[PDB]
Design a binder for this molecule. Structure first.
Ligand code: CHL
Ligand code: CHL
Ligand code: CHL
Ligand code: CHL
Ligand code: CLA
Ligand code: CLA
Ligand code: CLA
Ligand code: CLA
Ligand SMILES: CC1=C[C@H](O)CC(C)(C)[C@H]1/C=C/C(C)=C/C=C/C(C)=C/C=C/C=C(C)/C=C/C=C(C)/C=C/C1=C(C)C[C@H](O)CC1(C)C
Ligand SMILES: CC1=C[C@H](O)CC(C)(C)[C@H]1/C=C/C(C)=C/C=C/C(C)=C/C=C/C=C(C)/C=C/C=C(C)/C=C/C1=C(C)C[C@H](O)CC1(C)C
Ligand SMILES: CCCCCCCCCCCCC/C=C/[C@H](O)[C@H](N)CO
Lengths: 214, 226, 40, 220, 207, 82
């Protein structure tokens, strides 16, 4: 089985089953089966959220830097949209919290009790759809085009593609924040500046990554 | 079996089957059988390339004694642009080298005309494609002549290059300079390293030789260790 | 060496090492970043 | 070496039990029982097969650049060959910070694979890196034979030549390590760099010793 | 003793046995090792190829007519400029209309990749229907000249080869225009003038 | 915030890190042969394999509260006569 590091000792609770099980639990965090299950759902949610966010920071930018759109920088769009829409931060956030809270509540209870949201009579007409299939995979209303119903090996491929792309997107978001935090420019700007003089424009030569006093 | 040093004992790996075996592996390089098989292909390829080269350097000095073989490229007018000549040369050599290597990898696989399957080279030994329209004498005898001639040529080339770095002329001009003052043109007569002194021959090759407006770095082989 | 390393593992020796490293770290930190009153 | 009656370090004194004589360049020399532990021996053997190999390359450089600078060839002496301007690159210009980071980055990858195989033999030979397997295996601790590390096949060939070659490596490596301390200590006393120190000692051999250099012997 | 090899003297990939048309044993990155994927990837070669054969004949032709002068001002427009060229409706309307049109043909064709032999039937006219055919080779009305009897096998090994060449052709046109910034025929003429100095290397070196 | 506030969490994180790593080691040597001789002659190897495990101590500590494993049952702790 592919491992995060060749020769690394596979833990024990990480038996090839979860999508992306490369045997990486150095600090034995997922030792508890319940903890591992919650962490698995947490990972999927983190990856999916990051993938749908880095796509909203890179894609819109690459097209702005190609003249197609005019979207502002991810670290400036917030203010631009606030002054554009006119909605006050407070009201905008509060509404979002309530809507996100309700959807999170349903998913949360579905974990606490698997396939429980499909209670007879709960969500008017739809409870059935709110059943769920496996931990972080609410098949049905989600995955409408039925791509995870083709075979039992297209599921295991499409699921390794979600996790590897997610893990990458999650690290990409951390990078974008750190890049702007140190460089003070957009991600594309950083990449372009690096490709210009690759051997003279790195995190070392930024002034913030390593405060070299000596 | 003639040995490189009469009275020596040939290393076990050299039982002697390869043409031109003289039990010469002082450092035991071809100890690995597969390694020896590769080195064998390298020896033949090096010799054949060197044999053509040495001959060309000598001829290009009888016909056109002016252009120096070392700087010939910068002293000759290519009918085609170097970029174009290099491009064609790369693809041409790449094709022959690939088929040539594939035979060494899997013997008897590329022994056929890919464009015309009707044409097919007869079964042959690796290192010997099969192009033998004329073989003047026993194949093994001619094989020994090819390796002995090739080994001599390879040594001659290094001599051509080093002589071209110590002196600033080609093989014929250098030999004449020797024939003129035999006891005062030898390397000993032009370079001596004493326990305290270090006389090294001057490098007659400019560190960088400009070519068509592009200065080409031309270093004197280990000019520091002469 | 198995028994020398055992001695270098005894509580008094390990504590002497751990503390020396921790102390030196704080000393070196103030040496390059002096007067750290606030996290700014 | 490579014998029960192998020549020893202090003729007479018996050799240590852990030092049987198999290990390359074994002369039974461990006065402070540093390698009393068998696992310690393996680690110490690997470490020596690491310091000596780097030391050998380093000595080859301090001698080649030095020989050049003495003959005249523009070559900065080992001590001043760091302040020398970094050369440009097709990609761009080199920066000291990037250079150090790149040097450590690449080293971390190789060191990890080497140590991981050292801790778990054959771990690297799992076709994980582009299918390379046996080439990523280790013939012996400190001997990573293969078709990528021993291309010519000295290890794959006559074992006697391999064993002899192993002794050459250990003895030459130990000499290079000692030589390197010289290059550094002669510099931090003479301030001239080797091949100039060999040249001064061959011009006035009797009045150009360590005793007459100011730093070595303080009173003299 | 088997099919032609992309590189004579090399072994055939295990998954590539020769069943597929044009199976010259070429999958170095092992992209189509998965048989299920080999099936999708195969159909994608056909569709991507057939569309590129039309794309290459849709660029070389207009330029050929323009060069001869036979082509009208429309042909005088370079393919990489036809987008700006006016016609009757704005670029948006044309794209939207072609989308709706494509949705029907594409979905109807997919019904055949998903359930092979389940789309061959005129919806409006029950009487009209295509005969049984390999997924990817519709036949029937899609073969009006009835060439589906005369050596289908070698006419199919003629399509894949032409398709692969046409696909590399459309790559060359874009790449040459990406660097040279000229029409394909212009680049070809630039070569046939000084061919030993207008090579990509010389051009990129000059850049 | 840089004064007292932010510094507060910083100490709490390291404090819990030190405490969590300590309990991890204690509960590993418990059981192991003579647990009393691994407190005087500390097992520096295993002590060095548990130090980094306390980096994500908050995540592991909570997972233990929400699993009833951080504390001991009241009927297994000796208590002084009332
Ligand atoms: C993962 C989620 C998320 C992230 C990473 C960011 C990140 C950012 N938002 Mg933000 N936001 C996010 C969610 C949301 N924002 C907004 C609404 C806004 C607005 C209205 C604005 C931002 C702005 C910003 C940027 C400046 C932050 C700021 O005002 O600090 C101010 C504090 C400092 C400058 C002090 C130093 C802080 C540093 C971290 C230390 C910044 C890069 C601002 C922007 O566009 O930047 C110009 C801005 O005006 N966001 C909403 C709606 C409720 C969000 C979620 O619901
Ligand atoms: C009477 C008290 C009462 C309370 C406290 C709740 C609480 C809740 N109900 Mg609920 N319900 C209540 C009555 C009733 N519910 C329902 C029918 C439902 C349904 C159908 C669902 C819920 C759900 C939920 C949860 C939604 C999470 C959310 O939106 O948070 C977001 C956070 C906020 C909106 C912020 C709250 C602000 C705070 C009150 C004030 C400011 C501080 C939540 C914890 C959902 C759930 O998770 O079910 C599993 C859901 O799907 N309820 C009925 C009719 C049968 C009720 C009748 O009395
Ligand atoms: C591995 C052994 C090693 C040794 C024995 C030395 C020794 C020396 N280095 Mg050095 N270096 C070594 C590795 C390396 N150096 C450098 C980069 C440099 C530079 C840029 C310079 C030196 C210089 C020097 C000399 C002066 C030291 C000084 O003033 O501090 C400065 C020391 C350093 C910047 C690095 C020292 C690393 C140990 C000195 C003799 C200086 C010189 O040339 O003296 C005139 C100098 O300017 N080194 C790199 C790459 C980052 C190294 C390894 O990767
Ligand atoms: C395989 C299909 C296809 C290909 C290869 C091209 C290729 C091209 N189109 Mg294009 N198009 C294609 C389909 C279509 N185009 C258009 C409508 C247009 C317009 C309106 C224009 C192009 C233009 C162009 C050229 C400049 C690129 C561009 O638009 O930059 C845009 C850059 C980014 C989006 C970044 C380019 C060679 C441009 C052109 O020829 O002007 C010189 C142009 O103005 N196309 C439609 C709608 C009918 C298409 C399909 O429905
Ligand atoms: C919040 C995001 C997140 C979450 C919840 C998880 C959760 C999990 N990962 Mg994972 N991973 C992530 C991000 C995440 N990962 C990213 C971005 C990468 C790319 C490097 C990876 C790469 C990765 C590999 C290669 C493997 C896992 C594995 C696992 C499972 C092992 C059990 C475990 O360690 O418990 C969960 C861990 C935690 C709850 C700790 C939270 C993270 C800490 C607090 C942040 C500390 C810094 C962190 C290292 C980097 C961010 C800065 C587990 C369910 C293993 C597996 O698949 O087994 C089935 C495994 O092989 N992950
Ligand atoms: C490109 C700039 C450059 C320059 C100006 C020099 C200049 C010099 N090199 Mg050198 N070298 C270079 C690049 C360069 N080198 C590179 C990239 C390598 C790695 C392969 C080497 C490896 C090298 C070695 C091993 C040696 C020299 C030596 C020398 C000195 C001997 C004189 C000579 O020209 O013959 C050059 C000597 C050779 C053995 C020729 C082989 C290496 C040449 C220089 C590379 C040329 C081809 C390459 C594509 C550029 C000389 C001052 C000799 C020396 O140190 O003197 C004491 C020496 O032995 N060089
Ligand atoms: C997107 C176009 C495309 C696609 C989908 C395929 C798909 C396929 N080809 Mg193919 N091929 C193509 C273009 C394509 N080809 C072109 C343009 C050429 C001319 C050089 C060839 C020449 C070729 C040969 C000689 C052979 C194949 C073969 C195959 C099959 C083997 C499985 C495989 O390789 O995995 C799938 C491969 C892909 C999905 C390719 C993806 C496109 C890449 C990733 C784009 C990357 C950029 C590119 C370098 C430009 C497979 C179904 C073998 C076969 O058995 O035929 C049936 C075989 O012998 N192809
Ligand atoms: C794993 C080591 C460890 C841990 C996790 C704890 C944890 C705790 N101690 Mg405690 N303690 C320890 C060691 C430890 N102690 C030692 C060695 C001593 C002797 C000096 C004491 C003496 C002590 C007293 C007198 C009291 C506590 C109290 C407490 C509780 C209050 C929380 C607090 O602020 O800590 C408090 C910690 C201290 C006051 C001193 C200990 C601080 C040391 C430096 C930490 C131990 C590090 C350890 C050596 C690491 C081992 C690593 C291993 C690999 C070798 C708490 C649960 C209080 C309590 O009972 O609450 C009700 C209290 O009254 N401790
Ligand atoms: C469910 C459903 C239903 C049915 O079934 C169908 C359908 C519809 C299809 C489905 C859907 C799905 C989805 C949504 C998906 C998504 C995806 C994504 C977005 C990904 C991303 C993904 C993403 C990612 C990876 C990311 C990446 C990024 C990166 C690398 C970055 C990098 C960088 C950094 C850091 C910084 C600098 O300065 C710059 C750079 C250099 C640039
Ligand atoms: C097989 C293999 C295997 C191994 O493993 C790996 C590897 C090697 C990678 C692989 C390979 C692959 C490849 C090569 C692929 C390719 C593809 C292509 C190129 C396609 C085309 C494709 C192409 C195409 C479609 C084309 C298209 C086009 C079109 C529609 C149109 C256009 C135009 C024209 C007419 C003219 C006008 O005025 C304008 C327009 C309108 C604009
Ligand atoms: C464009 C990048 C192409 C990289 C070159 C080919 C991909 C290399 C992937 C390495 C994966 C292991 C190498 C091969 C392993 C064997 O075929 C089996 N799959 C593993 O035993």
């Amino acid at each position: 089985r592919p491992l995060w590091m060749p020769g690394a000792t596979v833990p024990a609770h990480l038996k090839g089953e979860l999508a992306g099980d490369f045997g990486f639990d150095p600090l034995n965090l997922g030792k508890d089966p319940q903890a591992l299950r919650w962490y698995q759902q947490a990972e999927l949610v983190h990856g999916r959220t990051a993938m749908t966010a880095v796509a909203g920071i890179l894609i819109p930018g690459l097209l702005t830097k190609a003249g197609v759109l005019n979207v502002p920088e991810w670290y400036e769009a917030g203010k631009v949209s606030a002054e554009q829409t006119g909605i006050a931060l407070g009201p905008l956030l509060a509404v979002q919290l309530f809507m996100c809270g309700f959807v999170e509540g349903k998913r949360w209870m579905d974990f606490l009790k698997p396939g429980s949201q499909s209670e007879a009579g709960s969500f008017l007409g739809f409870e059935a759809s709110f059943k769920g299939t496996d931990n972080g995979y609410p098949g049905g209303p989600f995955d409408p085009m039925g791509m995870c119903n083709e075979s039992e090996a297209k599921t295991k491929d499409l699921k390794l593609k979600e996790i590897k792309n997610g893990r990458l997107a999650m690290l990409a978001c951390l990078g974008f924040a750190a890049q702007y935090g140190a460089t003070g420019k957009g991600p594309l700007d950083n990449l372009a500046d690096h490709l210009a003089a690759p051997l003279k424009t790195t995190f070392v030569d930024n002034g913030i990554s390593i405060p070299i006093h000596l | 079996r003639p040995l490189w040093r009469p009275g020596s004992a040939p290393p076990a790996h050299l039982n002697g089957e390869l043409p031109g075996d003289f039990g010469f592996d002082p450092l035991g390089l071809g100890a690995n059988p597969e390694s020896l098989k590769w080195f064998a292909e390298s020896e033949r390829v090096h010799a054949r390339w060197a044999m053509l080269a040495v001959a060309g350097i000598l001829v290009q000095e009888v016909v056109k004694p002016d252009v120096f073989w070392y700087d010939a490229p910068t002293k000759i007018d290519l009918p085609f642009n170097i970029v174009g000549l290099l491009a064609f040369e790369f693809f041409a050599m790449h094709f022959v080298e690939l088929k040539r290597w594939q035979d060494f990898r899997n013997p008897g696989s590329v022994d056929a005309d890919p464009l015309f399957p009707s044409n097919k080279l007869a079964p042959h030994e690796v290192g010997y494609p099969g192009f033998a329209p004329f073989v003047p004498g026993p194949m093994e005898e001619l094989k020994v002549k090819e390796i002995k001639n090739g080994r001599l040529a390879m040594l001659a080339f290094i001599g051509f290059t080093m002589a071209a770095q110590v002196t600033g002329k080609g093989p014929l001009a250098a030999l004449s300079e020797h024939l003129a003052d035999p006891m005062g043109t030898t390397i000993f007569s032009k370079a001596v390293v004493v326990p305290g002194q270090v006389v090294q021959p001057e490098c007659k090759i400019p560190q960088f030789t400009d070519f068509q407006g592009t200065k080409i770095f031309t270093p004197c082989l280990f000019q520091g260790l002469w | 060496m198995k028994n020398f390393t055992t001695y270098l593992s005894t509580a008094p020796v390990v504590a002497l090492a751990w503390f020396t490293v921790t102390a030196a770290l704080l000393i070196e930190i103030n040496r390059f970043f002096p007067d750290p009153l606030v996290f700014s | 070496a490579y014998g029960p009656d192998r020549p020893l370090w202090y003729p007479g004194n018996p050799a240590p039990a852990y030092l049987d004589g198999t290990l390359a360049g074994d002369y039974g020399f461990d006065p402070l029982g540093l390698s009393s532990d068998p696992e310690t021996m393996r680690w110490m053997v690997h470490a020596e097969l690491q310091n000596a190999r780097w030391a050998m390359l380093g000595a080859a450089g301090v001698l080649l650049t030095s020989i050049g600078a003495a003959v005249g060839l523009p070559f900065p002496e080992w001590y001043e060959a760091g302040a020398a301007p970094l050369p440009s690159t097709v990609h761009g210009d080199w920066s000291f910070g990037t250079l150090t980071a790149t040097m450590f980055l690449l080293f971390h990858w190789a060191e990890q694979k080497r140590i991981m195989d050292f801790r778990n033999p054959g771990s690297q030979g799992d076709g994980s890196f582009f299918g390379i397997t046996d080439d990523f295996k280790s013939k012996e601790n400190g001997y990573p034979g293969g078709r990528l590390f021993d291309p010519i096949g000295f290890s794959r060939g006559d074992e006697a030549m391999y064993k002899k070659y192993k002794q050459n490596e250990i003895v030459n490596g130990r000499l290079a390590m000692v030589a390197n301390l010289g290059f550094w200590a002669q510099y931090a006393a003479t301030g001239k760099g080797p091949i100039q120190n060999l040249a001064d000692h061959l011009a006035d051999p009797y009045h150009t010793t360590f005793t007459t250099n100011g730093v070595s012997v303080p009173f003299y | 003793a088997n099919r032609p090899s992309w590189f004579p003297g090399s072994k055939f990939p295990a998954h590539l046995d020769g069943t597929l048309p044009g199976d010259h044993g070429f999958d170095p990155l092992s992209l189509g090792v998965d048989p299920a994927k080999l099936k999708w990837y195969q159909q994608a070669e056909l569709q991507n190829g057939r569309w590129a054969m039309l794309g290459a004949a849709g660029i070389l032709v207009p330029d050929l007519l323009r060069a001869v002068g036979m082509g009208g001002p429309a042909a005088q427009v370079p393919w990489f400029e036809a987008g700006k060229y006016e016609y009757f409706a704005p670029p948006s309307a044309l794209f939207a209309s072609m989308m709706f049109l494509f949705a029907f043909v594409e979905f109807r064709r997919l019904q055949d990749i998903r359930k092979p032999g389940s789309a061959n039937q005129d919806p409006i006219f029950t009487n009209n229907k295509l005969p049984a055919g390999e997924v990817g080779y519709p036949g029937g009305i899609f073969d009006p000249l009835g060439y589906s009897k005369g050596n289908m096998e070698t006419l199919k090994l003629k399509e894949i080869k032409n398709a692969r060449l046409a696909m590399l052709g459309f790559a060359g046109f874009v790449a040459q225009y990406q660097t040279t910034g000229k029409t394909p025929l212009q680049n070809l003429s630039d070569h046939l003038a000084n061919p030993w100095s207008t090579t990509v290397l010389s051009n990129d070196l000059a850049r | 915030a840089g004064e007292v506030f932010i510094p507060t969490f910083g100490f709490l994180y390291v404090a819990g890190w030190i405490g969590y790593v300590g309990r991890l080691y204690l509960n590993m040597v418990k059981g192991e042969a003579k647990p009393t001789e691994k407190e005087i002659i500390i097992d520096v190897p295993a002590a060095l394999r548990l130090t980094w495990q306390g980096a994500t101590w908050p995540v592991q500590v909570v997972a233990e509260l929400r699993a009833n494993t951080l504390t001991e049952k009241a009927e297994n702790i000796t208590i002084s006569p009332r």
